[PDB]
């Protein structure tokens, strides 16, 4: 029986009801291996505290995403880069310690207008999106696979722009985590059910990058 290390409250990634896209992906992997699926639930030292499989974190990567810029639709048209001069007077929200914070300090985007959230709402990224919907901030810098679905649930239209022009890097490949023969069997599953896994990522508005 496939045992997956997952979070019972971490939408859009996973939830105990099985509604996250990593639950759908773990269900695809279990069906491919002709086996049942069970979870060891724990809240996100998650790894060594936790089962046999981690869906998102190594095996061959099955998608590549980036940190994104999120803003209310129509307020910062064509916003693509962190050095855009329109951000100098904007309230910016970001999770403290995340990779983009080095570029913010590099561009002197520091101080009062920078809302650093510590890593009411299910996740900290959900709160940042909610603060953006309630105009408590004007710009949100979050991990793509989380912000895409969360923006769809916010209630106000938003623009999700992947950060591709920032010189640490802000783009990351995502693989499964684990026994290199077991990693070999999982790489086989990712290679076969690629079209099904990629369709699940698109349904949850996960920004997908090439290469």
UniProtKB/TrEMBL annotation:
Superkingdom of origin organism: Bacteria
Cysteine pairs bridged by disulfides in the record: 5-51
Keyword Glycoprotein included in the entry's annotation: no
Keywords: Signal
Domain Solute-binding protein family 3/N-terminal residue range list: 1-207
Protein name: Solute-binding protein family 3/N-terminal domain-containing protein
Source organism of the structure: Methylorubrum extorquens (strain ATCC 14718 / DSM 1338 / JCM 2805 / NCIMB 9133 / AM1) (Methylobacterium extorquens)
Species classification: Bacteria, Pseudomonadati, Pseudomonadota, Alphaproteobacteria, Hyphomicrobiales
Residues of the full protein shown: 37 to 273 of 284
